[PDB]
């Protein structure tokens, strides 16, 4: 979400963090992902750091005797050193050399603090008589060739959690959909780490992660998907961005104007009101439809229209005519032109007469396509065919 600055609890140029007492776990993320619990408590030995494979070939820059805290060039390399510096032959060559931030120091009769050293020592605790200033990391191992303590200045750091959030209301629809704040602070590592020479500025970040909790669906479905979004509202009197954590289901419909003869046409409404739990429980759309004529609509499957087949009739769609024969004839019969049909008389139709009744027939078209024994058919009764749709084939 959001990234916080702070130059505080940031370190100077690398260093060890021989801190005392914040709490945050290994947590998966004793790494990045921090719920930085509790800290007044984070003290550092920001150091210089210069770690390089090459031989043992070049500079006896050194510890036991420190060398220039100041700007030498070691093994054909520098530092804006702050201190007393250590080699790492471990390799018949070496790999690494660390200026040690800080004053060198000065001793001898080594038992004294070599006896009394392993701790990072304290202001006003003296040396051996020689008072101090910060919780002085003294050298846990008094400097070699005899003569020096070590005192890389140490600065200790705090946090409890979250500085104030300004006139803000993290919010969603929030009827379980839990879109809401959380200041994710941050700190890269621990006591037992010595860092490398620039800054580990981050040891408290506040990124922000703004979670979306609950597992309900009607409102808040997409647990790993129901994702934030951000516009620029509250940009008037309080133009200062709020910052929406808004998440979504912003669906669609089609045309709403795609009116057609056969195609059930299209008329239509919303339900909206901008700014409601999607206006609660919300029946959205419409699509009202034409018919290629106004007449009896049979061949229907009570329910929706997953099929595209429904009558709409008339005395011709369900054909009808005059019988010059009597108030005569019977129900429903699938005429082929000229059978015994104005009885005595004969005429055109193919399909359902439904009756013949002032001589008012009701004599539909429905075409025999007399088939053969043997088809590899297509379709059905009542399946109001669609124009040209490829009905039964016979192999």
């Amino acid at each position: 979400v959001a990234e916080l600055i702070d130059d505080r609890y940031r370190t100077t140029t690398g260093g060890f963090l021989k801190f005392a007492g914040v709490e945050v776990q290994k947590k998966g993320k004793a790494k990045l992902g921090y719920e930085v619990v509790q800290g007044g408590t984070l003290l550092w030995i920001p150091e210089e750091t210069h770690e390089v494979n090459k031989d043992i070939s070049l500079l006896l820059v050194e510890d036991g005797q420190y060398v220039e805290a100041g700007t030498e060039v070691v093994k054909d390399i520098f530092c804006q050193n702050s201190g007393v510096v250590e080699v790492t032959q471990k390799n018949d060559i070496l790999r690494e050399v660390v200026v040690k931030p800080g004053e060198l120091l000065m001793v001898d009769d080594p038992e004294a603090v070599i006896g009394r050293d392993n701790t990072l020592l304290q202001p006003g605790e003296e040396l051996l008589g020689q008072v101090a200033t910060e919780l002085r990391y003294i050298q846990y191992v008094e400097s070699p060739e005899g003569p020096a303590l070590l005192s890389r200045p140490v600065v200790e750091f705090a946090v409890p959690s979250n500085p104030d959030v300004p006139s803000t209301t993290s919010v969603s629809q929030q009827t379980g959909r839990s879109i809401q704040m959380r200041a994710v602070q941050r700190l890269p590592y621990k006591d037992s780490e010595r860092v490398k020479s620039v800054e580990g500025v981050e040891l408290l970040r506040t990124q922000l992660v703004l979670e979306i909790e609950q597992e309900g669906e009607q409102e808040h479905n997409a647990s790993p998907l129901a994702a934030d979004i951000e516009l620029i509202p509250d940009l008037e009197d309080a133009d200062v961005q709020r910052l929406q954590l808004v998440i979504l289901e912003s669906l669609v419909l089609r045309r709403d104007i795609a009116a057609d003869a056969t195609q059930g046409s299209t008329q239509t409404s919303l339900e909206v009101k901008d700014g409601d739990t999607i206006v609660p429980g919300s029946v959205v759309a419409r699509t009202q439809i034409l018919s290629k004529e106004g007449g009896i609509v049979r061949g229907v499957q009570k329910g929706s229209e997953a099929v595209r087949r429904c009558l709409v009739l008339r005395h011709s769609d369900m054909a009808t005519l005059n019988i010059s024969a009597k108030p005569k004839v019977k129900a429903g019969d699938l005429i082929v032109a000229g059978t015994e049909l104005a009885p005595g008389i004969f005429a055109e139709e193919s399909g359902q007469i439904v009756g013949v009744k002032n001589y008012a027939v009701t004599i539909r078209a429905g075409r025999p396509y007399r088939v053969s024994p043997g088809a590899v058919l297509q379709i059905e009764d009542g399946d109001l065919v669609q124009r040209g749709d490829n009905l039964v084939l016979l192999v």
Partner: protein
Amino acid sequence: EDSIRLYLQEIGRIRLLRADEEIELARKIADLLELERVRERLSEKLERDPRDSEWAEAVQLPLPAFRYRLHIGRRAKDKMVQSNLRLVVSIAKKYMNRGLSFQDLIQEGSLGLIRAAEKFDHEKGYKFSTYATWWIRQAITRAIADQSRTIRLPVH
């Protein structure tokens, strides 16, 4: 049958190293290198080549340990030229389109690689990445210019 890849796979299956790792080398390589030019000195003075035994070096050595020393000394280079492999292809490939032929290049480099691979001095510290690649380039250019044209013209 990619050929380029058919070799590219495999080189993959030899794995890259680091200065320190390539330092044990350097010494060994030199340890073998110079040793031979004994072998040549003794050559040139006499019989044209020591090229007998422990006297195939004028030097003193328990003979079996000689051949051994030789092995490790040069094995370093072999376990180095190949150890690199990639990067040279990143170079040669630039001339795979320039001319010659991806494979054709590769070799050439290789040649170089060698030469560098040994003319090379871990005392100046900075990695071969700022020196091996030199020799390569060289090698190469001297190939699409040395041929790839079927009428050799003054490369100058």
